[PDB]
């Protein structure tokens, strides 16, 4: 992970860095080898967390494309 | 489905006489007499002509009609017992320790003594039943023959003889000693 871009239900929790369900986070995607038009190399994108990671350990997220 | 009537037939040969009071069946044949007590089965007996006896159940269910062919078969077994008799043939095998079998009377009781089973020192006795005669068949080493009028005595005695010699705590793939039933036929033959 690289940042917590936006957490619903408050901006204070976005500041504190909380990872509840629905949070939007920024992940490093150099392992997927994405190239943009003009030939640059993406290494950071947005994903949404899709579980309550207080009822397990994993944080599960879906990329935003 | 509660049929109005179910029925079976028992055919009687030309030597034997069956006589049925309330439900105490008695068959007398060219070989002896046999009695059975069917008062727990709830059927109606009827004689037709000295060679045929019909058994019937009036308005009976599935479990009640199941117990009808079994009565037919018990009476048939009694008839074939008093005409042909039964002979079971058992055999014992061994690897190292010879099974030594004998008939011994213990105060007028006729036990069967089995010694040296797998080297054991216990003397297993099996009490012969009253009505079944036992003898060791010649011309065949290790062969014991039981015969009689009743099946439920010959077969039970054979079962006791077979189950008295189990092999506890050993591989029953490697250890083959025992006494097993070889054949179940009639005295006549042929």
């Amino acid at each position: 992970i690289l940042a917590v871009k936006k957490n619903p239900q408050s901006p204070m929790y976005t500041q504190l860095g909380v990872l509840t369900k629905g949070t939007i986070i920024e992940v490093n995607v150099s392992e997927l080898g994405m190239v943009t038009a003009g030939g640059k190399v993406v290494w950071g994108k947005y994903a949404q967390v899709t579980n309550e990671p207080d009822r397990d350990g994993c944080v599960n997220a879906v990329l935003l494309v | 489905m509660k049929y109005i009537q179910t029925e079976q037939q028992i055919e009687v040969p030309e030597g034997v006489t069956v006589s049925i009071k309330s439900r105490i069946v008695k068959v007398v044949g060219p070989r002896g007499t046999l009695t059975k007590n069917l008062k727990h089965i709830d059927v109606t007996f009827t004689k037709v002509n000295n060679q045929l006896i019909k058994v019937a159940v009036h308005n009976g269910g599935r479990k009640h009609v199941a117990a009808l062919r079994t009565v037919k078969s018990l009476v048939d077994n009694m008839i074939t017992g008093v005409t042909k008799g039964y002979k079971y043939k058992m055999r014992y095998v061994y690897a190292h320790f010879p099974i030594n079998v004998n008939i011994v009377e213990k105060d007028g009781a006729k036990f069967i003594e089995v010694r040296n089973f797998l080297g054991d020192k216990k003397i297993r006795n099996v009490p012969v039943r009253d009505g079944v005669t036992i003898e060791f068949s010649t011309n065949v080493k290790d062969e014991i023959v039981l015969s009689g009028n009743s099946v439920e005595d010959v077969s039970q005695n054979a079962a006791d003889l077979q189950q008295i010699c189990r092999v506890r705590n050993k591989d029953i793939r490697k250890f083959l000693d025992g006494i097993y039933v070889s054949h179940k036929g009639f005295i006549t033959e042929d």
Binding site: - | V93, N139, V140, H183
Partner: protein, 234 residues
Amino acid sequence: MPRSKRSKLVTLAQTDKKGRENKERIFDEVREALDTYRYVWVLHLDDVRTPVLQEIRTSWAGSKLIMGKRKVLQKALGEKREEEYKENLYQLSKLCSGVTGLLFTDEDVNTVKEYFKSYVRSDYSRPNTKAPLTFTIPEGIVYSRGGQIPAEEDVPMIHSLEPTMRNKFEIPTKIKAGKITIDSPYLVCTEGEKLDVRQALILKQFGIAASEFKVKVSAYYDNDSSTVESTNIN
């Protein structure tokens, strides 16, 4: 029997039931060939090794041999006088009893009635006949073929078929070192005896073909005269 009933056994094989169309096609073929030849015999071949049957077939590629359900052949011919394709047929249709059996041909009667007179093969007892021999199993190692060859050329019987002879064929056997052994004289059949079911099996186990099988005839029909002639050959 809403419950507590016999669960039938399903099995995964390639072939399928033949159905009604096979009976219909056979009953059509016999009737539409009935008016292509002239002589229609009937045969009684009960226990026929299929290679022998095929030899009989190929002994002439000019005449057709038909085999099928007995009642189907009857339904082709006609049961009562009041139904039949051709005329006077019932008088041979009322005769076919066993595994019949219908031979179409385009040949004189005598050649066929002598071909079926001079034919016989060697085979097994096919039980409930008479036992035409008297052999005893020797009293040592029971060899594969039974003991009626030079025993020093034979290989001892395999171990895997001891329980058959010990349970089903009712023969007192024991198992020493891998050879199967017997110690008492044994009698299978007495020559001149009605053979019950077990003796034919015990005999066929030792591969001694000692039975004459000849095809037999019971009736016959000629078309251009249209009247049956029942001649018995055995």
